[PDB]
Amino acid sequence: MKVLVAAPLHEKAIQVLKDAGLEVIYEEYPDEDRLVELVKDVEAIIVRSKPKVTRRVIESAPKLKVIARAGVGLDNIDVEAAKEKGIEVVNAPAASSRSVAELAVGLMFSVARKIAFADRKMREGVWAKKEAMGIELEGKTIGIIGFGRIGYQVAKIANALGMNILLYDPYPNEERAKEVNGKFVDLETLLKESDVVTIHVPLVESTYHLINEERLKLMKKTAILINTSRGPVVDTNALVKALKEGWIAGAGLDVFEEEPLPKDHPLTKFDNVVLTPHIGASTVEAQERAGVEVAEKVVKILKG
Amino acid sequence: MKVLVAAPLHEKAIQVLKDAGLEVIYEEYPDEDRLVELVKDVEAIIVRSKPKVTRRVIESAPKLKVIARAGVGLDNIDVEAAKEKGIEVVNAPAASSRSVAELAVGLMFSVARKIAFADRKMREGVWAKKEAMGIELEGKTIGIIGFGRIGYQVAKIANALGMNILLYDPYPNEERAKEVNGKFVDLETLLKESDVVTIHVPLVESTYHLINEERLKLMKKTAILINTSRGPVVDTNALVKALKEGWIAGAGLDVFEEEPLPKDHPLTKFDNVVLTPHIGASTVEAQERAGVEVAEKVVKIL
Ligand SMILES: NC(=O)c1ccc[n+]([C@@H]2O[C@H](COP(=O)([O-])OP(=O)(O)OC[C@H]3O[C@@H](n4cnc5c(N)ncnc54)[C@H](O)[C@@H]3O)[C@@H](O)[C@H]2O)c1
Ligand SMILES: NC(=O)c1ccc[n+]([C@@H]2O[C@H](COP(=O)([O-])OP(=O)(O)OC[C@H]3O[C@@H](n4cnc5c(N)ncnc54)[C@H](O)[C@@H]3O)[C@@H](O)[C@H]2O)c1
């Protein structure tokens, strides 16, 4: 049996494949034509955000058993074509849960204590101690919208910081909430009582622009918004307005409705926001973990 | 007895004085002149980084019993002139402990995940996703040099973040270590085994330039250094060299040997350093606890 690795993969992940006795074909980011030629005799394919596993590619792989994505999401995989041929499609979301949570917490600290701001000023020869007055997090209430894999990890860390945890999930997991001493409440209550609101929901019709003007106005004027889920979950225009009018005190953002962010975007003009280029899963540990996770899943399907 | 207030203080603070049955004189940041007449009748004075308590002032107040600083450090107070007249001077260290600890952690996060760097680039119209690969902290080892008030809080936070804790203190408190599951080890071991080294010692003879070239070489090439204690504890020139040579991966600094920092200081040129202007104690909460803590001291005494 052969596995085609069409993207960069960690040594240990490649090692999981070989220790299983599988043949590994390794050529990153091939074009479709080349890909179609590489999949003819493979039982599995492993990719990252690319290359694109189209229908043409799948219909050309007689032996294909599984399509694996080292990370989250299958936007680059024709999931319908796979389903038609009875080909399993797997990924490794759990691999970056902790890293996304850690970034969310990092953003919260940067906004609350004005660290990016102060550092930015320092490099301009300005000693901005007077305006780097921030806030202490111990005892504050953090409102977690979306209590899933990442939301759970954030709650774990919040509990580590001595924060009061509020959770709001249409499908509340009582057991896990109890483990982090988190209390489930309606979204209105969470928005009104939180000092820090962090978003961890998937992007579906139900969550598109979930954070809009109506809900931003419900938040405390002293509150901070953190979004590491997806751009479109937050109405950018409403957030910009909320920041300008002082409806909230600041925001930490890792995802946006335009990626990359256009030049001179309104959000980049606020001193009370910290922006990161969608690096929630960008840790060597999370990237390695995703590769190893899908390698194991591949092995279980094939050799099992 | 009467108590003067020469700096911005807080409702709760001002009131704890009146509860003890003292009178309160309040003016935000006065001056040596008016300061002389104001302190003349007062038996106590309270301040922050200001105003400045010179020897000329200490002399005007014959009734002055105690000088209180709502915070840490008395550089703006002629503690000797006061020591001559027998005037007790106090401050509120414990009040800012948590805030400094939280900054050290926030700095650890910003360096580890290149947050300040990424944000800075974003504002320059640069999407540095591919230059911002960072590291995950869970399971990593944090080395705490100076297991005191602030060192303890950092360990408390770190232990819960799932980090392995190493501690090095000439005066080890085993019981407190057990509280945060920290392990005491010699300094060399801490430096060689830590992924994050954070300094929380006072500036004393034995801590001057404690983090020197030799010790920096001992650290891991992938390690991060955090310093929220005092600039002098770290040999700035040795750190710049370590960063330039890649002996360590980066650093988060809130204190420096030159404050404010100079115009084109070499530290401001590294993308792997996060610099803050001595804001460790700069939180409204810390500021309030400070005023309240010294108020209780002004009361207990008079
Ligand atoms: N920033 C990054 O680099 C990065 C990396 C990985 C994932 N992400 C994104 O961040 C989020 C991660 O979420 P996860 O992995 O924990 O997903 P998950 O599926 O594990 O958990 C999602 C939770 O949201 C809840 N939920 C669903 N609809 C909701 C609603 N309308 N209101 C409130 N809660 C709702 C679900 O019940 C579930 O408990 C996703 O949007 C994911 O795409 C970002
Ligand atoms: N950055 C800020 O804004 C800010 C604010 C307040 C305090 N600080 C500084 O933080 C540092 C720690 O303050 P603290 O309140 O925790 O002090 P502390 O007195 O409570 O604890 C200091 C610890 O250092 C230990 N120690 C002494 N000498 C040592 C040595 N040679 N090597 C290792 N450890 C040694 C002591 O035993 C003690 O455990 C000080 O330098 C203080 O000035 C900074």
Side-chain angles (χ1 to χ4, degrees):
Chain A
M1 280 177 181
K2 304 179 174 141
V3 178
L4 164 63
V5 180
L9 196 53
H10 195 283
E11 209 173 296
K12 283 217 175 119
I14 293 301
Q15 200 49 51
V16 168
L17 297 184
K18 291 181 173 165
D19 275 357
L22 304 168
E23 199 163 335
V24 180
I25 309 294
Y26 179 122
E27 179 169 340
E28 351 156 349
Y29 312 134
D31 76 18
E32 197 184 32
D33 277 330
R34 174 61 173 170
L35 188 55
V36 174
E37 199 67 21
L38 289 181
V39 302
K40 57 185 185 112
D41 188 29
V42 306
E43 280 72 7
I45 299 168
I46 295 183
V47 302
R48 298 272 185 178
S49 66
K50 38 172 182 181
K52 282 201 139 267
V53 186
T54 70
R55 175 184 293 282
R56 184 199 165 192
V57 170
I58 289 178
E59 287 186 321
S60 305
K63 289 190 169 180
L64 193 57
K65 265 180 118 217
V66 50
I67 299 167
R69 166 91 149 87
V72 65
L74 324 153
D75 42 76
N76 58 308
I77 298 167
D78 193 311
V79 289
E80 276 301 307
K83 183 185 181 183
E84 302 182 356
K85 303 294 189 181
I87 297 173
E88 294 188 58
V89 177
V90 299
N91 57 2
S96 63
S97 305
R98 182 60 181 212
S99 290
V100 179
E102 281 184 9
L103 182 62
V105 174
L107 289 171
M108 177 179 62
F109 276 108
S110 186
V111 177
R113 288 305 290 275
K114 283 146 150 52
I115 296 178
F117 170 75
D119 173 86
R120 186 164 62 255
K121 288 298 174 198
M122 188 82 83
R123 292 176 200 266
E124 298 175 336
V126 179
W127 185 261
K129 167 155 176 154
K130 14 311 277 193
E131 36 269 354
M133 181 66 70
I135 68 157
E136 188 173 274
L137 293 183
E138 184 169 49
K140 292 309 189 298
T141 294
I142 182 173
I144 301 173
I145 300 178
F147 192 54
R149 284 188 299 270
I150 297 172
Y152 175 77
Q153 292 304 314
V154 171
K156 240 183 135 168
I157 294 173
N159 224 40
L161 297 175
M163 300 182 86
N164 188 49
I165 294 176
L166 289 189
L167 320 161
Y168 163 83
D169 199 310
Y171 311 107
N173 182 312
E174 299 300 339
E175 179 167 61
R176 272 161 55 227
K178 185 182 181 180
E179 306 181 342
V180 297
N181 195 17
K183 295 300 190 306
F184 287 111
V185 297
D186 48 294
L187 182 55
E188 171 185 51
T189 290
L190 182 149
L191 285 165
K192 270 171 79 187
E193 289 167 25
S194 296
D195 296 302
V196 177
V197 177
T198 181
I199 308 321
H200 302 285
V201 305
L203 174 52
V204 295
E205 186 170 59
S206 143
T207 52
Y208 179 71
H209 282 188
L210 172 62
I211 304 302
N212 52 26
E213 198 168 307
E214 171 179 276
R215 280 132 177 172
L216 286 167
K217 286 164 67 170
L218 284 169
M219 290 179 60
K220 303 186 178 186
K221 293 183 178 59
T222 49
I224 290 175
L225 179 71
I226 304 294
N227 184 25
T228 58
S229 67
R230 301 278 307 282
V233 176
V234 169
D235 182 325
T236 297
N237 282 341
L239 177 56
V240 172
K241 186 173 183 180
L243 293 161
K244 182 203 242 121
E245 306 308 335
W247 290 352
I248 57 174
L253 314 163
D254 184 59
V255 297
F256 311 83
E257 291 186 280
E258 287 177 279
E259 297 189 2
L261 211 49
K263 198 194 176 249
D264 290 317
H265 185 286
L267 285 171
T268 71
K269 308 308 174 194
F270 296 110
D271 283 319
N272 56 333
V273 306
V274 176
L275 314 168
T276 53
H278 197 151
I279 51 173
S282 300
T283 59
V284 295
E285 292 81 10
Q287 301 297 328
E288 183 182 353
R289 187 172 301 119
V292 170
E293 197 195 313
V294 299
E296 301 184 329
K297 289 186 174 179
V298 165
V299 171
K300 182 159 178 143
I301 295 168
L302 292 211
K303 283 288 173 104
Chain B
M1 293 172 252
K2 155 201 253 145
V3 185
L4 175 72
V5 177
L9 197 76
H10 231 240
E11 191 275 305
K12 196 195 191 194
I14 297 169
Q15 193 55 57
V16 174
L17 294 180
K18 295 175 181 175
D19 277 58
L22 304 163
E23 207 255 316
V24 179
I25 308 118
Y26 167 89
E27 177 170 359
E28 171 176 353
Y29 295 154
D31 228 5
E32 220 177 16
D33 296 61
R34 34 244 83 190
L35 184 63
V36 168
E37 94 174 297
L38 292 178
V39 307
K40 106 179 133 113
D41 214 36
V42 318
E43 281 92 304
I45 200 167
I46 304 183
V47 326
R48 309 252 185 202
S49 46
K50 256 117 111 184
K52 25 91 243 128
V53 181
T54 64
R55 166 186 292 285
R56 172 169 138 197
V57 184
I58 300 295
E59 182 56 58
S60 184
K63 332 203 168 147
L64 178 62
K65 252 111 200 130
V66 56
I67 305 179
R69 218 269 223 204
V72 295
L74 311 172
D75 41 288
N76 68 307
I77 300 169
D78 199 301
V79 174
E80 206 57 13
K83 171 100 190 179
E84 269 174 31
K85 302 319 169 131
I87 301 177
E88 188 174 359
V89 188
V90 296
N91 44 25
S96 64
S97 301
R98 180 61 177 207
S99 280
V100 181
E102 282 183 14
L103 181 63
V105 172
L107 281 177
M108 173 173 68
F109 269 114
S110 188
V111 167
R113 294 297 286 280
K114 303 176 168 169
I115 302 173
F117 165 74
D119 177 78
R120 185 164 69 256
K121 290 295 172 178
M122 191 74 83
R123 292 171 199 269
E124 296 173 348
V126 171
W127 194 265
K129 175 154 173 149
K130 290 189 118 66
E131 300 75 35
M133 179 67 71
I135 64 166
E136 186 176 278
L137 299 171
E138 195 185 24
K140 288 303 190 302
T141 292
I142 183 168
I144 302 185
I145 298 174
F147 190 52
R149 272 194 307 265
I150 298 163
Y152 178 82
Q153 287 305 306
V154 172
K156 178 174 178 178
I157 294 181
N159 179 37
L161 285 182
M163 294 183 86
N164 180 51
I165 299 170
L166 296 189
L167 319 157
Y168 163 83
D169 202 303
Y171 305 105
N173 187 307
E174 293 307 311
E175 190 279 318
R176 248 155 115 251
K178 193 172 175 178
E179 270 175 42
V180 299
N181 193 41
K183 175 187 169 198
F184 278 108
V185 296
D186 55 83
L187 182 42
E188 214 180 69
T189 288
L190 183 157
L191 290 170
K192 286 174 83 200
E193 283 165 29
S194 302
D195 297 303
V196 184
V197 170
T198 183
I199 309 319
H200 302 287
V201 302
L203 175 51
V204 291
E205 194 287 310
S206 75
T207 64
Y208 177 76
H209 276 196
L210 178 79
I211 300 301
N212 58 34
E213 198 171 309
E214 185 185 295
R215 300 203 165 85
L216 281 171
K217 290 185 182 162
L218 287 174
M219 292 175 57
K220 303 182 181 192
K221 272 50 207 170
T222 56
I224 293 172
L225 177 76
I226 311 293
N227 184 24
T228 58
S229 67
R230 280 197 71 181
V233 179
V234 174
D235 184 332
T236 301
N237 295 309
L239 173 51
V240 166
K241 179 182 181 176
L243 290 168
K244 171 199 189 184
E245 302 281 63
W247 293 343
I248 58 169
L253 314 163
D254 178 53
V255 294
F256 313 88
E257 291 180 278
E258 284 180 284
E259 285 177 31
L261 218 44
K263 177 187 185 301
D264 295 302
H265 198 285
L267 285 178
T268 70
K269 309 304 178 180
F270 295 106
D271 287 313
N272 55 330
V273 303
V274 173
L275 315 165
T276 42
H278 203 155
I279 52 169
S282 292
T283 54
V284 280
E285 292 73 19
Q287 282 309 14
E288 181 187 86
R289 285 201 298 271
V292 174
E293 207 202 300
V294 299
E296 289 194 316
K297 286 193 190 185
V298 182
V299 169
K300 181 169 118 217
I301 268 154
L302 287 184

